[PDB]
Design a protein around this ligand. Structure first.
Ligand SMILES: [Ca+2]
Ligand SMILES: [Ca+2]
Ligand SMILES: [Ca+2]
Ligand SMILES: [Ca+2]
Ligand SMILES: [Ca+2]
Ligand SMILES: [Ca+2]
Ligand SMILES: [Ca+2]
Ligand SMILES: [Ca+2]
Ligand SMILES: [Ca+2]
Ligand code: NA
Lengths: 175, 175, 176
């Protein structure tokens, strides 16, 4: 079965979404969901010795300006395996242009890890952690010759609006 | 393809069963099989710094008193990845009540690891290892406020009888 | 969805194939894709404290003399997870007889790791690394009492010809 096409975007959209993880925190391999088969695929190995600072994946049944599902970053203490579904609370959004495409990314925490119970907005995240995520996306494709721009961070309300936008984009793209 | 519904309980029931592993030994993340989609889901992160002492999963095409497939614990030297099928020999059964529900769990060894060839019954397991498993289930929900009660251990025959019961409970629930 | 039957052998066969990895480098557990159900299965735990020296898997929609899809070994710096697709460039082939069956294995590198951009043929691989792979296959079944023979290595052209053979064997076996 196809997790991208057959799983709803979330159980309580947009307050709680499903994050389908592709890349566990700590990986240098850039795994992606193969949208046609539903299997994991190695898109590439990052060209620099950088690792994903968050569990990285997609919101099911979303689409975005770069021709892929909406990107979601989940803060997990123990990383999950690829293709794991996490119930995630959006708390903010990273504003990124990637190679000329809008490619903003939801920042979210797991609903079912009580460690994060008081993380509800972008102001709850350590500043250095936001900077480390932004810096990763600012530099990780430098050796690929691709231009990226990190514009800053939006709050949970802006993230939730963008989730609704991406959900609608999927419905327009796939009928 | 849903392995819970579409895979038989075992190749030589109840002497050899299939264990579909959800949680590798050493995990604090409580992964589960999503019984509808067949994907792995993060049910929760354990509230305490405890780790699963066994590879933990389900027997396909079983059902149990707590509204879930029959739980199986497989002793693996190297943990397997989530959603791996193991041919497993039941050697005993942990007698547990969980939140008022019977929730006994098969203890089994992999047929195809020769290290365990002489493990055939509950008396073959080091006492401290049985105690460590029981203690995990005695305390792992304490910060969730959910009562568990470990009554003791049954032998391989009692485990095999319970497997047959759980197989019949699935046919009744889903037949 | 059965990856063995429903994934194509590659995007540019035989220059680039898909490797569907079953066993990450470093594993002692011998994971296998079940050919009928598409689920990952533990076939066995290796009887000796050896680990797979390569990411190990199959080329989809192939068939081979041992009654199984064609085995492929991918050199990955960071191992992948079981059931991951890798776009792989064949660079050589290990000539192995296993329990009386021809069971040669493609050696390949990931197209999308620039570390391997200049690895194009068997002469690009450190000799000690080829020896370590051959030695693994020479001894990993010794405690199972199963005879293997490692005859040597073939080059990228021979590997590609054998991939084409295995693709045609699949079509013949499965009526495609
Ligand atoms: Ca993406
Ligand atoms: Ca991007
Ligand atoms: Ca993107
Ligand atoms: Ca269970
Ligand atoms: Ca329970
Ligand atoms: Ca249970
Ligand atoms: Ca094989
Ligand atoms: Ca073989
Ligand atoms: Ca083979
Ligand atoms: Na085999």
């Amino acid at each position: 079965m196809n997790p991208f096409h057959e799983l709803e975007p979330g159980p309580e959209v947009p307050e709680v979404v499903y994050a389908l993880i592709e890349i566990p925190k700590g990986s240098r391999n850039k795994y992606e969901l193969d949208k046609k088969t539903g299997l994991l695929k190695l898109d590439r190995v990052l060209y620099s010795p950088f690792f994903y600072p968050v569990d990285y994946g997609i919101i099911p049944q979303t689409w975005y300006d770069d021709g892929d599902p909406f990107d979601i970053m989940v803060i997990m203490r123990e990383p999950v395996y690829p293709l794991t579904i996490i119930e995630a609370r959006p708390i903010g959004i990273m504003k990124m242009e990637d190679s000329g495409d809008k490619d903003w990314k939801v920042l979210a925490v797991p609903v079912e890890d009580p460690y994060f119970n008081d993380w509800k907005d972008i102001s709850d995240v350590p500043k250095a952690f936001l900077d480390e995520i932004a810096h990763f996306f600012q530099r990780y494709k430098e050796l690929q010759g691709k231009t990226t721009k990190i514009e800053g961070w939006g709050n949970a309300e802006e993230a939730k609006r963008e989730i609704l936008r991406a959900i609608e984009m999927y419905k327009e793209k796939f009928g």
